[PDB]
């Protein structure tokens, strides 16, 4: 539980790191993305507006904001490295889990040379993917509007976050209330912290659980659909679809996984009598 | 969930004629598609062991059962890393899939839950 | 010198009123005062320091 | 077992700042290590802050 | 103690004027009946483990609510399980004994984790006293089996769950069980035992495998934790005169910071040694022992010589004064034994389970100087003397030296 | 319902107190004295214990040998013990040997020789006792505990006294001690078992009538101790077992909190790994200690004196690297007496004590000790009905109030003996006497 | 420097009449101004102990010497933290300043140095 919980914080730190780094370009998407995302803080009751002006260092996103985002963008990766180390130290008490979900205390292998050389394969596969993007299609994953200098007057046609934040943006849109939307968006990440509680299984992991595997498949594909819906226009019928997908996202944690894991426990016991 | 819960709920189902008529065939199919038998496991080999209660139950296993469990875990680990399935005598047959651990963990848990209850007793 | 039941002399240090509430309260007054100044000092430090992030004078001049 | 000893993360802090066994007779010249840690913390806090305003 | 019978179980109770009752179950299951070495000790330690109606844990938590206490011990003749409680809580304790005798689970984990470790600590605590060891070793030499079996479970001979389960099948039976209630209304106990112990097996009387045979010899238990020496004389015909002789020869002081006026006490003058004469009646055989402990092997050796001399001197001539002193010390010893709950239970237990009528302390026979000297003479002229040395055994006496 | 304790006085002021039991055949008669080592000064410290030796060394009539013989002929035994506030001399005998035993006790107390030759002989015996208590670890620990808790005060002195005094105690100062202290108004003749009260009173009139009365007769159990938070460390790496006592200033016999403190003590309770039932006890500390193998044993105590007491715990452990945990968890359970205890723990402990106070008295010697102790500390025997009412009056909220003024954030006296490297310094132990979360 | 070297050099000086005439008085003044005796130390208490050789020498001390050394270290530590000096019987007198450890460390080092030499022997 502890390495997983620290991991959830690593994920939040990565989001903040990447968001601030994107602003540093100070193109149109940089400015307008910063504007809309920082305005979500205005939803904090009573002090929300004051906090936004405090974060900006002024009355809109400008020079003070850019300079502080640079300093914090530099810092945050060091904080992230520390938390990455912490989650590994926490893991070291139990060791790695494995795909069968059973103990490995019966049959251990040294990290080196076995996993050192196995890691090299994926390092080179990664570097091949890296090469194809960096050298042959360097702008495929980006937005053309970020090659336009920031202009507070002109609003871009569509203000979308970077692709990796899109599912959370879809979750925010699903809730009509401002504060509601912000809470839901944050809850979508913090709800990962309750997996240790809501998974009622007596068995670790999904390798032997057909129903859990199907549920997992639907959960993952729903998360991808949320991603797609984060970048469509706020138009029919995507508005209602985004709401249904948001309900499904949360119901995985709150309803489906607790029910499915309870039933599978019973099926394992009765089925093997 | 505690093994106790799982066992009690299952027994409620097995008592009800209607309930058993529906659940028992589903459970048997589930177990067939689960495919743990194709790695030579018994169902009880899959139960999470990293808990004080389960570590205590495992220490109470008869040495023979304990040695055989170790072999099944090592054998399954070898099938897993090789991406192979058991064949022949390595496949767990339905009649071999015995609940060797359930009685031990039920006793461990019975005491642990009684202890929790008795820690909360109120003299009347 | 030999007997361990003869406690060494602690009379130069011992307070007569060592068991009284007044005795304990005095030392907690010192601890409490130290905690009080540390809280006041931390608050002042945090407030003054973090105010650097609020709009600077040149930004407020253009508002 | 006390949590500060049981939990591996807490135990690392414990081993350096709490249960760490020290000689009983360190004099005031053993205080410069913690002053250096203080200088480092001040420089990080003030330096990161200057970086928010410096070009 | 009004002896009666309730549903095939012998029940003895004596009402009193106290808020405290002792209820004891005496079992014919002591070590002379042990099928396997140490099994009686293990069975004793298995009392009040998990039963089918009530877990060990639940029993202990409820015992604390009554403020009751539990005492168990094993002898060569009995296992004794005693509870001490407030008078009114009698039904609970009767039912608890019934659960133990009828429905003990006997689980392997209890044996490994609970029972055997407690049995091992019990023995190590007793062995801290080298005099205990010496007297145990002396019984082993003298009788070999039966009375010669060890009372306690030892590591070198492990008791299995099957051993204990088999022994309990024999022992936990109407034929081997006596119930003794101190400060318990006799009519009330009979009614309760009659309802609670009705479905207990009848079983059969447990017996000693083989007849009691007497042997002489030596045991040399090398320890590093103190020095003791027992001089025992096996008795083929146990007679009550040996009690008087044991108390006469004496050994412990009746007074603080003193030696004592007993012959054996006077054998220890100038030495930091203690001595104790004891007589053990086991019905069909007996043991007369003189145990000497001390820190110096040289002093023990010195006392041992004077001790056998004292016994020879007694065989020569006792005075009338000394014979009266023996009667007084023996009557007192009998009285305090009948008062102490542990020994009391076993005394009446013997009367119920065997048929040996208890000798009331007020009926303890006065032995003339003739009868006492004759008793000591037989012992000095024994063909089978036993000597058990414990500690620095190279420096302690041998049988042929004594 | 036990038979009523009868009580009579003589003219000199000697109390006679008796409890008959027509079911037994033996009787314990003896003299309980409201006097002990605490009555000595620093110069004659050890006198009370010295006298106990010489009481059995011969009288004006019977020599040492005649004394031995007289008791041997009676059939029972004599016993004596001297504590800080109490001296006892008793005789266990047969029912009809009671007149002999009263006569012997009266002789050794009033008419003891205290011959220079015997003083000189015992002076070596007692010197050897100084180097052999060293083995009785519990006694070593508790004697240092008193020495430090009552630093430089009469309760802080040992019973044996210093080596120097043993060499210089004279028959003069022995005589002076027993003349000043062993007075009729401070003495109780006690009979338990097969004794008739009326017979015992007659024997008292025959043997103890010429006892001195004190000039100023105060009531029995009449006494200022100033507790010192402090520690004694007797580290010995060669010992396998650590022995640790921790105490706070407790309650006197006549405190209004006497029963409250007993209930608090029973909530923590005792533990011994060698007893089969101990792993199943309800006490939270018992559970922590047994599950984690932190100790071989612990024993809660609440020791009372006339004007003070010590309340605490005695621990023994082989787990030398987790002494810190053992002490930590012990003091955190004490914290809960202030912060957390409710009717659940209190009613459980009261149930256990209502029986325990009666169970303890199971033989004539225990009964006599109970009568004698109560008469010399309270001036009366408290009936079980009164004791049941006083226990019933203790509420959870009395326990909380008591613990908050007696335990919470208070100075402790701490003694460690053996491999105690793992026992932290005084501050870290004393810091566990409160909870920052509360 | 090894204790061996220190002892050997010192012995060369003590042999030489002229050398000893100059060095012994200086060494005695040095030791007086050093002031370790004012904390109740013996000279050998100051020798660096955190080496394999010295740990071995300390283990070979007779138990009494070992117990006394522990007390001197604890006592000196207490003087150090209190900023006090020894008084009275706590001050080490010149006659009490015995080389209790030197023979043990010289034996440990003799073997260690012989081992080093013999590891480099060449059959002729
Ligand atoms: C920079 C940031 C500011 C923070 C301040 C940190 C400074 C603290 C520190 O390490 O120095 C204090 C420090 C006090 O430390 P201490 O722990 O009391 O003593 C350390 C030694 O034992 C002290 O040695 P001692 O016990 O032998 O005492 C001698 C010393 C100190 O005398 C004292 O009594 C103090 O007296 C002198 O000042 C030397 C004589 C010079 C005369 C001209 O002062 C000195 O030791 C000064 C002497 C240095 C030369
Ligand atoms: C798209 C939907 C994916 C569903 C996966 C279902 C299982 C399957 O077939 O996978 C093959 C394998 C099956 O592996 P296995 O370990 O269950 O089985 C191995 C073979 N046997 C059963 C014989 C032992 O599954 C994986 O390897 C799953 C890894 C999951 C990674 C998902 C990344 C998505 C990121 C979204 C984050 C939020
Ligand atoms: C830098 C900011 C400092 C914040 C201190 C604010 C108040 C806390 C304080 O003084 O701590 C006292 C308290 C208590 O000090 P204490 O531990 O000496 O007192 C405990 C005993 N009683 C409760 C009976 C007084 O310390 C803490 O709670 C720790 C927090 C300090 C950081
Ligand atoms: C800077 C401001 C000062 C520190 C702020 C804390 C306030 C102090 C009051 C609190 C206090 O005394 O309570 C203790 C808290 O101290 C503590 O827990 C902390 C003790 C002192 C903290 C400083 C540590 C070293 C400082 C040097 C800097 C290190 C370099 C890194 C920059 C409890 O503690 P107790 O055990 O005495 O409890 C005793 C019983 N509960
Ligand atoms: C900078 C980002 C991260 C790095 C460098 C990192 C690195 C690692 C490494 C090297 C391991 C051990 C090998 C492996 O299983 O892959 C590991 C395991 C783990 N990480 Fe991460 N991680 C990161 C982020 C996260 C996040 C965001 C989470 C959770 C939300 C997480 C949770 C875990 C868990 C639970 C394990 C143990 C998995 C197991 O072996 O069963 N980590 N991580
Ligand atoms: C060991 C830690 C550090 C030391 C010794 C140090 C030292 C210095 C020094 C000597 C200066 C010149 C100051 C002046 O005269 O104006 C300076 C300037 C600066 N430092 Fe650092 N520094 C440290 C850490 C940092 C960190 C972590 C940052 C984070 C960015 C930082 C940012 C700056 C900036 C922006 C300036 C220029 C503005 C100015 O002069 O004040 N420093 N530093
Ligand atoms: C978790 C911590 C909670 C959030 C921390 C809050 C951060 C910002 C809080 C307020 C900072 C600005 O708040 C403001 O502080 C400055 C000093 O710093 C004060 O200013 C005051 O002192 C300064 C100098 O010290 C003077 O120049 C000024 O004339 C005077 O008004 C203001 O009276 C206060 O309104
Ligand atoms: C200084 C700021 C506080 C943060 C702590 C500093 C981070 C550095 C910690 C990581 C380095 C590993 O640190 C290492 O941890 C273990 C346990 O935690 C310590 O181990 C020590 O303590 C534990 C119990 O406290 C014992 O089991 C062990 O016998 C002892 O050696 C090591 O002596 C230390 O070197």
Residue numbers in the entry:
A (entry chain N): 111 to 383
B (entry chain R), G (entry chain G): 2 to 125
C (entry chain E): 39 to 101
D (entry chain C): 1 to 55
E (entry chain B): 15 to 416
F (entry chain A): 26 to 248, 260 to 474
Question: Mind quoting what the paper says about this structure?
Answer:
Electron transfer within the complex occurs through the prosthetic groups of the three catalytic core subunits: heme b L and heme b H of cytochrome b (cyt b), heme c 1 of cytochrome c 1 (cyt c 1) and the [2Fe–2S] cluster of the iron–sulfur protein (ISP), often called the Rieske protein after its discoverer.
The consensus 3D refinement of combined particle images from all samples except the sample with atovaquone yielded a map with a resolution of 2.0 Å [Fig. 1(a)]. The three subunits of the catalytic core Cob (cyt b), Cyt1 (cyt c 1) and the transmembrane domain of Rip1 (ISP), as well as the seven supernumerary subunits of yeast CIII, Cor1, Qcr2, Qcr6–9 and the less tightly bound Qcr10, were well-resolved, consistent with other complete structures of CIII2 within respiratory supercomplexes from Saccharomyces cerevisiae. Except for the sample with added Pf-type inhibitor, the Rieske domain map density was weak, as is commonly observed in uninhibited and hence unrestrained CIII2. We identified 1326 water molecules in the 2 Å resolution map of the dimeric complex.
